[PDB]
Design a binder for this molecule. Structure first.
Ligand SMILES: [Mg+2]
Lengths: 58, 370, 209, 91, 7, 186, 787
């Protein structure tokens, strides 16, 4: 109840960026499987209380 | 915590007594039958009354003043500290100097009318909840397993057994067979009336008088726990939640039917059928086609007992203990009495001009009118 | 009990909108529920359902918000404003997730919903926040895996530790949780006396930090 | 510390179960399918490029100690066994 | 007697 | 003004009875009653009786469909041929019906097909509820003999017929009560 | 009839295009009455129309339809014993819920479903009716009217065909009950099919454990009275003759472990057949096979019965199976509790070979935790792997906080009050914080406790406690003195053997003594501490600060926690003041309880309880008089007044605080006192030795149906307390309280059972060996003080 009353509110939290690991010469890191992949989406939208999540008038 | 009943119990009717009822005498039997549902009721034969309790006590009382002639207990004691009740549940039946009583321990006793010593004792398939009908030198017993057994009188050894189907859920109590022309007609808890030869147990015919069955059980109970009545080659049966029907004695053809059920016995006098509906609604149907003549709906849900025709007036008890005299011509109450506070559950007995009834506490009453 | 008089639907909708602007969600929910029950298929059906989803989300009524979201998706598979519904689904799942050691199923559901949104509607206005939340959820899941790996390191199960760190290196290869988990895998390999694998993990660690 | 043993720990088990008969049922030249059929699917492998199956049999009963058998199978590019290394006990 | 109610 | 063509006269579980169907049965009885008008002189009661007739047929048909009882056309071809002793069944019958109701050939065969499904299911359940004791036919045959192997056979047939009618009548009453029926006629 | 346009009228929710697709007919085609009929039938088969009146105009095909009304609201009336939310969930699960179309065909179905639910509950006269109220815009509201009756209760449970065991004895172990005494808690008198199956299986096991291999249940009957207010249950059985166990034969692919199994299948030739022992043997074989890696070691027993000699030869079939390895162990539903809290209860290690027994043990430990309402397991297979599985645990979390209150009465503590608030799972961390408080005639206590169940992964727990205790001696039948003390205490717990549990810790306690009646022992102790008070006033005071190292050891082996019949419990507690404290003493205690059954049924038991204690000073000081040992009461020596055994006070002459005649005063100057004086007020001693031998027998007169819920016993209690520091030479005239030979003995009968008011224990004892000053108290009872 109280815990999610903040999440229901606007609680913009930004975490650290994601950086890929480096494979040392002579060995290769394991495959990724693409199960959790974040594609690159261009454009400059609004985030963190700057986004109007009110339903559109339709 | 309160939980009201679905249907309100009817109030006590107010009636002016045409004749004042009385109580000739009353004798006490130990603890009676309690709150358990049992067929244990008194019996009368040769100016003496035999009664018993659920614990095992049995008494023989004089029918004129209630004086005790002999008394015995059928409860085995393992010394002076242990005592196991016999759990008598079969209506006391007396015939040919014997007193037959059923037991919940699948035991059948046969005492002597002279001194009460056990003439013989037999083990049956299951609980002997039915009245030990006696006829043609046999003692028909309808156990709670759906097994109809025929014991001998002098010996007590089982002669033949007939297995009747039993449903998952039924109503406590077993139908007492009726015998006619060397054939025993019995009702089963599955809703079918069966006729069996008294020599071997061969099933002459079996007819179903239950009306229908719903999706769920409980509401599809069709236990024929009444005692079928046979007159002039016609068999009358009355199933719980079912239809009152008249069946041909030889073939089982349903001559006619009527939608009304009950578990209390009914009387067949002249051209009238007096019966108590499962809702405690006394009715007087006609023999020819079951056309209703009159109805008495002033005792709804009072838990009446089996009616008995005494001096031309039906007599029925109730859980409150009041004994109601109701006329047969129209059905109007003719007298009302208060006898016992424990209440009446088992059928009354009327014979030899004496009306006997036993309360839940075992107090056997003899009723008269002056 | 918060009764709603039988006013015209236009007036009731205007009242609901005004009470939504004020920020009072309970009154808006009551008004919109009354308008939905009384006019289940009127012109203000889709609009009222969207407003109900929004109000349920902002009122912390997450189960009802989720139910309304699924109902809207089922009944309007191709509504023009369906990217918004998917975004609200992701937000509701994130709120239900709400503590990285607790159940991550809600985080996985939110990640799946946001991934669907971004992969379906790259031009939507709810896409940048969707990617930000996806990054956060990926980090959260990697942290959960790392916590389990730490617990097994404490317990002494050196095979579970290596298996889980390999699973992290496979699924979430680019997270601080994986970077911090690599030493656990090295320690497990050394404890089980696999010096070759320990050296390999040591080279991997050195090549990055 | 002598206190870890005295405490009431549960049984700790890790890795595959080697019965000392399956390990004798393997030879050089068998394929991955045959090895898996004989011993079962290994709990661990080498994800850093080379393909290698690590059959570790670790068990640590309460206040008993640790015993491990390391069986390392090195295959080739075609999934054919090429080398077997068996460590009866850990030093 | 001992009553115990869960909050 | 618009003219009503067809509608739903009553609802039976998930099925329905159409106002067209009641009209069709209305022709069947009056054509039968044309031979003997005394058979069905009533009009309102006849309409009510027909309405119940179709309602029970729908109940039986749905029950038969649930179990999965099906009949192929080859059985239909044999079923239609029944009065071939004095008629060119399937040749003269096809042509003859064109003058009475044979606007579409399949209609007659399609109609009869249903009648075979209800009969098949009715017999299967009704006979399942029947129980026969040997003592009945032994004594039943003795009564007829008063009025060997072949005689007790007759007892079984009469006894089986007698039990079938009683069980069938009971099953109709039970099925009608247990199903959902709603008459609209509005 | 050619159709140029197809139009629909009355449509509300179904799309015109979808309905047009549904119709076999389409615009621009010939159409006939058969086609109209087929279209109507299809439209109705769609399941969203109540009546269809397909029509044809002069040119257009007009269709009038009536869609099924949408449910606007659901109301209930009369659901007294069934909650409205419960009815709502049942209904949505059935399919009816708000916002959907009201199918006018399922009213009877819903009513019968509700009636069936009521019948399952036990109310066989319940009637349910549904009222449908039309509303505008094709909306309908349904109201469910309930007519709940009176629940049916069992009136009798009967067993027919039993000759070796009484029906009451057999029913004694049944879950279903036909007698519920008001003075005992044994359960309710309701009927359920699950209960019937369970107690039928219980009867079967009861008969199979005595050697009745051929036991069989012919049939069971359930009956109702015509009023349907009572239920009668009858069970017909056919008990055979007792059978012996000739031998055990094991066959199958044992996987080379035949030698180790024959040792698990050893029996004495001529032993009575026992299904419980057979099941134990099967479980032992399964445990062995699991210990050797196999995950599903199926084991079956097929006894061969020889009636000629009444012997049973067991045929055991063992199949080892295959080995499955656990890849992952997942917990779902732990929204509050963290992953480690659930995972540390696991006996199954991830990344190791699977074990069904280990998985079940983990599930049982999770259940014992008490943080979850339900716990379930699911061993999902891993795709693409024939021998790898994932174990998933689904847990429904339950509230852990709990307010608590309690009231009890007894002869020793009088009226006892308890109150506290507990939190067994602090923020889903496993910590158990709480504050508790108790008060009785002579003491009020209040503590704040915080404990970490897992200070170490092995299971070591670190405690913590702040307490405040006020003790009034005179109210405890001792010499007058008040002791208000507070302090803190942290302890560790080391489980070592699954029955033994060591524990060590530290603590600081501050004691403030006041209102002390001068007496020889108290003044001896005070002088030992260097105090020099006066033997003239009762307004003395004394304060001390002590740091103690508390250690203990608890061995528990009792089979049951309530009315144990076998096992032994031994508890040892200690204490010692570390340097830097005002006091310098050590205290040791030892409590023992041993149960030795003397019959197979464990109905006759012999109980032996002993209590020991000793303490003394170290640096020439004395053990504090408020740490003394007290004997006598309903817990140490029944028949003696509480805290009455031991040395008695010897007051010096002293003026009372506020003298007032008509009140008894202890040896005061205002009453003519000029020398020391003996009294009858207990003071306790620093050494204690109490023993008790109690014989437990079945209750003789209570009905055998529930006679197992009342425990009767005859006891012979012994005890003695003495003061080791008493100087007999100085006080020659007064009794020597340093002699341990003064043994107090008593005997009597005690009763004990559970009552709605709480646990009850009554005892009547007649002390036949007492010394001067001992106050006897025969009848003693304690109602609910155990809470
Ligand atoms: Mg019955």
């Amino acid at each position: 109840r109280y815990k999610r009353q903040v999440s229901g509110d606007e609680a913009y939290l930004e975490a650290a960026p994601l950086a890929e690991l480096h494979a040392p010469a002579g060995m290769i890191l394991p495959v990724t499987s693409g199960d959790y992949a974040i594609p690159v989406t261009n454009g400059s939208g609004a985030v963190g209380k700057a986004l109007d999540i009110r339903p559109p008038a339709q | 915590n309160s939980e009201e009943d679905v249907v309100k119990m009817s109030p006590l009717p107010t009636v002016e007594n045409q004749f004042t009822p009385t109580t000739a005498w009353s004798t006490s039997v130990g603890s009676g039958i309690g709150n358990f549902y049992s067929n244990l009721h008194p019996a009368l034969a040769d100016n003496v009354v035999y009664a018993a309790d659920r614990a095992g006590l049995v008494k023989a009382l004089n029918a004129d003043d209630g004086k005790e002639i002999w008394s015995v207990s059928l409860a085995e004691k393992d010394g002076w500290f242990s005592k196991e009740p016999a759990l008598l549940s079969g209506g006391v039946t007396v015939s040919g100097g014997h007193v037959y009583i059923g037991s919940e321990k699948a035991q059948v006793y046969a005492l002597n009318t002279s001194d009460g010593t056990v003439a013989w004792q037999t083990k049956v398939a299951g609980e002997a909840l039915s009245r030990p009908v006696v006829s043609d030198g046999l003692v028909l017993i309808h156990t709670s397993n759906g097994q109809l057994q025929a014991l001998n009188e002098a010996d007590g050894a089982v002669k033949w057994t007939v297995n009747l189907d039993m449903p998952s859920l039924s109503l406590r109590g077993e139908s007492a067979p009726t015998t006619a022309f060397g054939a025993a007609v019995v009702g089963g808890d599955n809703g079918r009336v069966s006729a069996v030869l008294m020599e071997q147990g061969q099933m002459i015919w079996q007819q179903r008088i239950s009306q229908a069955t719903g999706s769920t059980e409980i509401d599809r109970l069709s236990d024929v726990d009444t005692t079928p009545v046979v007159v002039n080659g016609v068999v009358f049966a009355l199933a719980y939640n079912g239809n009152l029907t008249a069946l041909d004695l030889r073939s089982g053809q349903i001559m006619w039917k009527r939608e009304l059920g009950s578990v209390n016995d009914f009387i067949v006098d002249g051209n009238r059928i007096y019966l108590v509906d499962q809702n405690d609604r006394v009715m007087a149907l006609t023999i020819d086609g079951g056309v209703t003549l009159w109805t008495q709906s002033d005792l709804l849900h009072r838990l009446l007992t089996s009616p008995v025709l005494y001096n031309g007036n039906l007599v029925v008890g109730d859980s409150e203990g009041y004994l109601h005299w109701i006329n047969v011509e129209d059905g109007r109450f003719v007298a009302q009495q208060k006898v016992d506070s424990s209440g009446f559950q088992t059928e009354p007995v009327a014979a030899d001009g004496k009306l006997l009834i036993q309360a839940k506490d075992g107090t056997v009453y003899s009723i008269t009118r002056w | 009990k918060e009764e709603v008089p039988d006013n015209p639907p236009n007036e009731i909708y205007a009242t609901a909108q005004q009470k939504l602007q004020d920020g009072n969600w309970r009154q808006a929910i009551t008004q919109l529920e009354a308008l939905d029950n009384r006019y289940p298929f009127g012109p203000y059906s889709q609009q009222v359902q969207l407003d109900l989803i929004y109000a349920y989300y902002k009122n912390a009524d997450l189960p009802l918000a989720q139910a309304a979201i699924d109902r809207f998706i089922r009944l309007n598979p191709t509504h023009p404003n369906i990217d918004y519904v998917m975004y609200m689904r992701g937000l509701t799942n994130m709120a239900l997730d709400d503590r990285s050691d607790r159940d991550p199923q809600h985080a996985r559901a939110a990640f799946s919903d946001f991934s669907k949104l971004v992969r379906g509607y790259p031009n939507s206005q709810y896409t940048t926040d969707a990617t930000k939340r996806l990054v956060f959820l990926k980090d959260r899941l990697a942290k959960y895996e790392y916590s389990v790996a730490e617990y097994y390191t404490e317990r002494g199960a050196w095979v579970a530790v290596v298996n889980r760190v390999e699973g992290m290196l496979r699924d979430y290869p680019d997270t601080q949780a994986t970077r911090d988990a690599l030493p656990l895998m090295e320690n497990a390999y050394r404890q089980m006396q696999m010096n070759a694998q320990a050296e390999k993990v040591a080279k991997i660690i050195a090549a990055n930090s | 510390s002598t206190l870890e043993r005295v405490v009431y720990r549960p049984d700790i088990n890790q890795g595959n179960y080697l019965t000392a008969n399956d390990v004798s049922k393997i030879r050089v030249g068998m394929t991955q399918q045959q090895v898996a059929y004989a011993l079962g699917t290994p709990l661990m492998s080498d994800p850093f490029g080379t393909n290698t199956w690590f059959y570790v049999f670790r068990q640590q009963p309460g206040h008993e100690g640790v015993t491990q058998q390391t069986l390392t199978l090195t295959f080739n590019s075609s999934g054919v066994l090429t080398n077997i290394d068996n460590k009866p006990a850990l030093s | 007697w001992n009553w115990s109610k869960s909050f | 003004a618009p003219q009503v063509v067809d509608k739903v006269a009553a609802v039976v579980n998930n099925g329905v009875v159409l106002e067209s169907d009641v009209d069709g049965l209305m022709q069947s009885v009056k054509l039968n009653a044309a031979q003997a008008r005394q058979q069905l002189p009533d009009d309102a009661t006849l309409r009510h009786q027909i309405m119940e007739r179709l309602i029970m047929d729908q109940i039986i048909l749905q029950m038969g469909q649930k179990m999965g009882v099906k009949i192929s056309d080859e059985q239909l071809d044999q079923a239609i041929a029944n009065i071939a002793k004095q008629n060119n069944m399937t040749l003269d019958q096809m042509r003859s019906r064109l003058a009475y109701d044979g606007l579409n050939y399949n209609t007659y065969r399609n109609q009869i097909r249903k009648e075979m499904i209800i009969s098949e299911v009715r017999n299967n359940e009704v006979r399942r509820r029947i129980t026969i004791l040997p003592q009945e036919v032994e004594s039943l045959a003795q009564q007829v003999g008063n009025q060997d192997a072949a005689q007790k056979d007759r007892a079984y047939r009469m006894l089986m017929n007698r039990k079938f009618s009683e069980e069938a009548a009971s099953w109709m009453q039970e099925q009608r009560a247990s199903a959902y029926v709603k008459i609209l006629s509005n | 009839f050619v159709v140029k346009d197809i139009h629909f009228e009355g449509l509300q929710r179904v799309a015109v295009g979808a309905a047009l697709l549904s119709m076999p007919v389409r615009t621009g085609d010939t159409v006939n009455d058969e086609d109209i009929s087929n279209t109507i039938r299809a439209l109705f088969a769609t399941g969203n129309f109540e009546d269809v009146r397909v029509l044809r105009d002069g040119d257009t095909l007009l269709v009038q339809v009536k869609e099924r009304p949408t449910i606007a609201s659901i109301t209930f009336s009369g659901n007294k014993s069934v909650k409205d939310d419960m009815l709502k969930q049942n209904l949505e699960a059935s399919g009816v819920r708000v916002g959907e179309s009201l199918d006018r065909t399922t009213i009877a179905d819903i009513e019968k479903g509700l009636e069936d639910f009521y019948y399952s509950v036990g109310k066989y006269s319940a009637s349910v009716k549904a009222v449908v109220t039309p509303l505008p815009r094709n909306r309908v509201d349904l109201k469910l009217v309930f007519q709940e009756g009176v629940s049916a209760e069992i009136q009798q449970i009967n067993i027919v065909g039993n000759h070796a065991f009484t029906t009451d004895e057999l029913i004694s172990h049944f879950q279903l009950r036909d007698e519920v005494p008001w003075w005992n808690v044994v359960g309710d008198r309701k009927y359920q099919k699950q209960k019937l199956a369970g107690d039928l299986e219980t009867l079967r096991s009861y008969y199979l454990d005595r050697g009745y291999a051929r036991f069989n249940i012919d049939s069971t009957q359930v009956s109702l009275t015509p009023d349907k207010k009572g239920i009668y249950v009858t069970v017909n059985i056919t008990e055979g003759d007792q059978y012996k166990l000739s031998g055990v034969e094991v066959s199958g692919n044992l996987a080379g472990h035949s030698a180790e199994i024959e040792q698990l299948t050893k029996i004495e030739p001529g032993e009575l057949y026992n299904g419980t022992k057979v099941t134990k043997m099967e479980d032992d074989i399964k445990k062995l096979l699991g210990r050797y890696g196999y995950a599903y070691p199926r084991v079956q027993s097929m006894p061969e019965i020889n009636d000629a000699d009444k012997t049973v030869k067991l045929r055991v079939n063992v199949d080892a199976g295959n080995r499955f390895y656990v890849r992952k162990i997942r917990f779902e539903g732990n929204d509050t509790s963290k992953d480690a809290v659930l995972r540390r209860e696991m006996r199954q290690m991830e990344g190791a070979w699977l074990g069904s027994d280990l998985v079940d043990q983990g599930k049982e430990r999770l259940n014992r935790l008490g943080f979850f309402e339900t716990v379930d397991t699911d061993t999902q297979r891993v795709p693409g792997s024939p021998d790898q599985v994932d174990v998933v645990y689904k847990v429904k979390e339950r509230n852990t906080g709990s307010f608590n209150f309690g009231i009890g009465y007894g002869t020793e503590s009088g009226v006892s009050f308890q109150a506290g608030v507990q939190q067994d799972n602090w923020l889903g961390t496993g910590y158990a914080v709480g504050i508790n408080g108790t008060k009785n005639d002579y003491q009020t206590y209040a503590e704040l406790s915080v404990t970490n169940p897992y200070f170490t992964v092995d299971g070591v727990s670190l405690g913590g406690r702040l307490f405040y205790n006020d003790f009034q001696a005179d109210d405890a039948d001792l010499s007058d003195y008040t002791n208000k003390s507070y302090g803190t205490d942290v302890t560790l717990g080391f489980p070592i053997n699954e029955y033994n549990s060591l524990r060590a810790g530290l603590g600081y306690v501050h004691n403030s003594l006041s209102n002390m009646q001068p007496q020889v022992a108290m003044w001896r102790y005070l002088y030992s501490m260097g105090e020099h008070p006066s033997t003239s006033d009762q307004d003395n005071s004394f304060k001390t600060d002590d740091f103690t190292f508390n250690y203990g050891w608890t061995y528990n082996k009792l089979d049951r926690g309530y009315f144990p019949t076998d096992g032994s419990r031994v508890n040892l507690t200690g204490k010692v003041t570390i340097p830097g404290s005002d006091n310098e003493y050590y205290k040791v205690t030892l409590d023992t309880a041993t149960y030795v059954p003397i019959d197979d049924d464990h109905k006759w038991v012999v109980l032996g309880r002993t209590r020991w204690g000793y303490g003394d000073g170290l640096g020439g000081k004395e053990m504090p008089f408020y740490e003394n040992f007290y004997a006598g009461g309903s817990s140490t020596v029944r028949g003696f007044q509480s805290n009455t055994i031991g040395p008695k006070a010897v007051y010096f002459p002293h003026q009372a605080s506020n003298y007032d005649p008509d009140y008894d005063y202890e040896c005061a100057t205002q009453d003519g006192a000029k020398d020391l004086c003996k009294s009858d007020d207990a003071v306790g001693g620093n050494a204690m030795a109490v023993a008790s031998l109690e014989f437990i027998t079945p209750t003789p007169f209570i009905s055998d149906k529930y006679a197992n819920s009342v425990r009767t016993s005859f006891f012979w209690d012994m005890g003695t307390v003495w003061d080791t520091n008493w100087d007999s030479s100085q006080y020659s005239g007064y009794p020597d309280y340093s002699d341990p030979s003064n043994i107090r003995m008593s005997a009597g009968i005690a009763l004990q059972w559970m009552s709605p008011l709480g646990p009850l224990v009554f005892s009547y004892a007649q002390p036949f060996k007492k010394y001067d000053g001992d106050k006897a108290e025969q009848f003693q009872f304690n109602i609910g003080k155990t809470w």
